Design a protein around this ligand. Structure first.
Ligand SMILES: Nc1ncnc2c1ncn2[C@@H]1O[C@H](COP(=O)(O)OP(=O)(O)NP(=O)(O)O)[C@@H](O)[C@H]1O
Length: 201
């Protein structure tokens, strides 16, 4: 199936761009979303976490207390292997279920570390969501509650903005009016539709 990889640095707003494609009927595969889905309230995976580490892993609303789980892994690195063994098969299975259930002309894959992990060959096209470096820092501080210095360190550990732009087939700047960004998405959607038809012929 024709696949577009959506990449971008921290704080770029990849998910708001991906949502626009989803609104146009595109199947969006996002491993971070799938990871949260497999531990949602009532899931067997969440129960396994609670039965091992305790009921404090479940908030009053039935959801995973993510900070408590991060604290457990921080104190007991051995528990990272147990968590991966529990969750990785579920994420892989749900990823494949969503792929197989798709009926859209192409798939949009949200890939956080495409350039870092050097995956810029497996998708048919690469779409980079770009913002200025200061915009990344500002948005990461707000969403994640980190210092500017922390945000700068994360940027240092990721591919450079220039590397991402260099690898991109298309660039969408997640800046300015939201309506114009949505219009930009619709323009790219048509491009991908025609490319998917070309590939199928
Ligand atoms: N156009 C925008 N203007 C302002 N804030 C935005 C915009 N688009 C997204 N955001 C915010 O920026 C933050 C990052 O967006 P999100 O889509 O969650 O990031 P991501 O790039 O998908 N993931 P990550 O690598 O972890 O940052 C969120 O708090 C969004 O609400």
């Amino acid at each position: 199936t024709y696949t577009v990889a959506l990449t971008g640095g921290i704080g770029s707003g990849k998910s708001t761009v991906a949502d626009e494609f989803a609104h146009l009927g595109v199947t969006v595969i996002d491993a971070d979303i799938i990871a949260r889905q497999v531990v949602e309230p009532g899931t067997p995976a969440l129960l396994a976490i609670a039965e091992r580490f305790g009921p404090q892993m479940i908030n009053d609303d039935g959801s995973l207390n993510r900070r408590r789980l991060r604290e457990r892994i921080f104190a007991h690195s051995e528990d990272k292997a147990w968590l991966n063994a529990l969750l990785h098969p579920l994420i892989q299975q749900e990823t494949r279920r969503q792929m197989q259930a798709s009926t859209s002309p192409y798939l949009l894959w949200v890939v956080p570390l495409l350039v870092e992990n050097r995956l810029t060959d497996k998708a048919d096209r690469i779409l980079v969501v770009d913002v200025p470096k200061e915009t990344q820092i500002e948005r990461t501080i707000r969403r994640d509650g980190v210092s500017r210095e922390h945000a700068e360190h994360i940027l240092a550990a990721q591919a450079t903005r220039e590397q991402r732009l260099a690898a991109a087939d298309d660039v969408i700047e997640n800046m300015g009016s939201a309506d114009a960004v949505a219009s930009h998405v619709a323009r790219l959607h048509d491009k991908y539709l025609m490319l998917a038809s070309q590939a199928a012929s």
